């Protein structure tokens, strides 16, 4: 009976499903997510759903009929403000650019090196520089 109950519990995540935004949490196993249909509903929450992905903007998935929070969908922020996708690489090698050895090293030392070798930064006691300003004559 327990595997049966788990099976129908999984079945409630069948794939007629509307999506709504997780506005706010009331208490355990319930929510106030508003559906994309145009209305906000006071709903119930699956136990299987982990509550830590229920950030108060999540585009959670709702049951079509009972209109209950049945699934939390991963956020959609792939290219909101033109974040460089895998097909939008500039295709400019470091060796392609000529000279600029000091300028390359300073830039590489604040925006590329800290991401990879953070341990070496932390080993001295300095937080890596967060902003660089390249300036000079045009071109």
């Amino acid at each position: 009976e327990f595997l049966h109950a788990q099976e129908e519990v999984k079945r409630i995540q069948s794939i007629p499903l509307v999506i709504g935004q997780f506005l706010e949490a009331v208490d355990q196993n319930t929510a106030i997510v508003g559906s994309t249909t145009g209305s906000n509903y006071y709903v119930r929450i699956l136990s299987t759903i982990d509550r830590e992905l229920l950030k108060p903007n999540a585009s959670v998935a709702l049951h079509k009929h009972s209109n209950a929070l049945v699934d939390v969908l991963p956020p959609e922020a792939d290219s909101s403000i033109m974040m460089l996708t895998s097909d939008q690489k500039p295709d400019v090698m470091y060796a392609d650019i000529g000279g600029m050895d000091i300028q390359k090293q300073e830039v590489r030392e604040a925006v590329e090196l800290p991401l990879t070798h953070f341990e070496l930064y932390k080993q001295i006691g300095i937080d890596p520089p967060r902003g660089v300003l390249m300036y000079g004559p045009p071109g």
Binding site: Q105, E109, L120, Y121, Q123, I124, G125, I126, D127, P129
Partner: protein, 101 residues
């Protein structure tokens, strides 16, 4: 800015020598300072250093050791880092500079 809305209007002036030395000591607590690095002298080399510029000086002193693959910063690593962070832009024109006697 009328009182009843803003009762206290607290000013944050640029830190003095005894204050800049303090900023140099809280932003270098985690830094592996050597022996003989007089933090007061570096503070004395920064007249009117805002307060974030002291942290920038500490960070650049550490950076001057990062490019050399070390963990300790010497006095010269700070003195050569003060001139970098505490850089100034001059008028670069005597004709404009002598507009006023």
């Amino acid at each position: 800015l009328r009182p009843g809305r803003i009762d206290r209007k607290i000013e944050f002036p640029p830190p003095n020598e005894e204050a800049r030395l303090d900023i140099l000591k809280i932003h270098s607590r985690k830094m592996n300072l050597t022996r003989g690095i007089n933090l007061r002298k570096i503070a004395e080399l920064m007249p009117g250093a805002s307060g974030a510029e002291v942290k920038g000086v500490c960070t650049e002193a550490g950076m001057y050791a990062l490019r050399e693959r070390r963990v300790h910063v010497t006095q010269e690593d700070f003195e050569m880092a003060v001139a970098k962070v505490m850089q100034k832009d001059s008028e670069k024109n005597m004709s404009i500079k002598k507009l006023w006697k």
